[PDB]
Amino acid sequence: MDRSLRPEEIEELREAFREFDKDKDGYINCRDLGNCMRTMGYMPTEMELIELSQQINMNLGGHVDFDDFVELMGPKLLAETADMIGVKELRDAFREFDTNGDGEISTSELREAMRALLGHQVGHRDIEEIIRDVDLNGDGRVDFEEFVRMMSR
């Protein structure tokens, strides 16, 4: 996976799995699969569904524990875009980056948030870089819109 899963993300994987597990009787159907993935915030293509059901129903013979589910769905959870996440959750994430609540994310705020996400400290050159790639109005701070673009394609 691109990074470790945070506790709130394991929690929604939990919820999705509880749904998945209750649904499943030998095989999981693509209707049920899609819905359990949406429960953790992910909008799948039909092709993704066909593929994952294949893996559950054919490769894993329908045998899937929490841990398999995390390996399978973790990468999807992590690839959720601004458009799947919705504004309330985007704003909530921003508010955790923006710890002094001023409405912008500073380099120290960024450094601290990256550390929390990646589980290691991030170089000063890296940060002042990230800021350069992300800051669209040159004010050396990141606003909501620039944060949201930071997770948009």
- Find the part of the chain contacting Ca ion (CB under 5 A) among 16-24, 32-40, 51-59, 129-137: 129-137
Least separation in angstroms between residue 150's CB and Ca ion is 11
What whole-number distance in Å separates Cα of residue 6 and Cα of residue 10? 6
DSSP string over 4-39: PPPHHHHHHHHHHHHHHHHH-BSB--HHHHHHHHHH
Q: In the numeric block, which tokens belong to residue 109?
A: 């705020």
Contacting residue, 4, 54, 100, 152, with Ca ion by CB under 5 A? 100
Query: Does the annotation flag 137 for ligand binding?
Result: yes
CB of 108 to Ca ion, least distance (A): 9
27 is in an annotated binding site: yes
**How many residues sit close enough to Ca ion to count as binding (CB under 5 A)?**
6
Residues in the chain, overall count: 153
Name the minimum Å distance from CB 61 to Ca ion: 51
CB atoms within 10 A of CB 104: 19
- Considering the complex, what minimum distance in angstroms separates the CB of residue 103 from Ca ion? 7
Q: What is the rounded distance in angstroms from the CA atom of residue 43 to the CA atom of residue 36?
A: 10
* Closer residue to Ca ion, CB minimum distance, 102 or 129: 102
Nearer to Ca ion, 9 or 146 (CB): 146
Ligand-binding annotation for 135, yes or no, is yes
* Alpha-carbon torsion, ordered 114, 117, 119, 125, to 10 deg: -20
Binders of Ca ion among 25-44, rule CB under 5 A? none
Structure tokens at 26: 């030998």
Q: Which two tokens stand for residue 150?
A: 């930071």
State the residues that interact with Ca ion by CB under 5 A: 98, 100, 102, 135, 137, 139
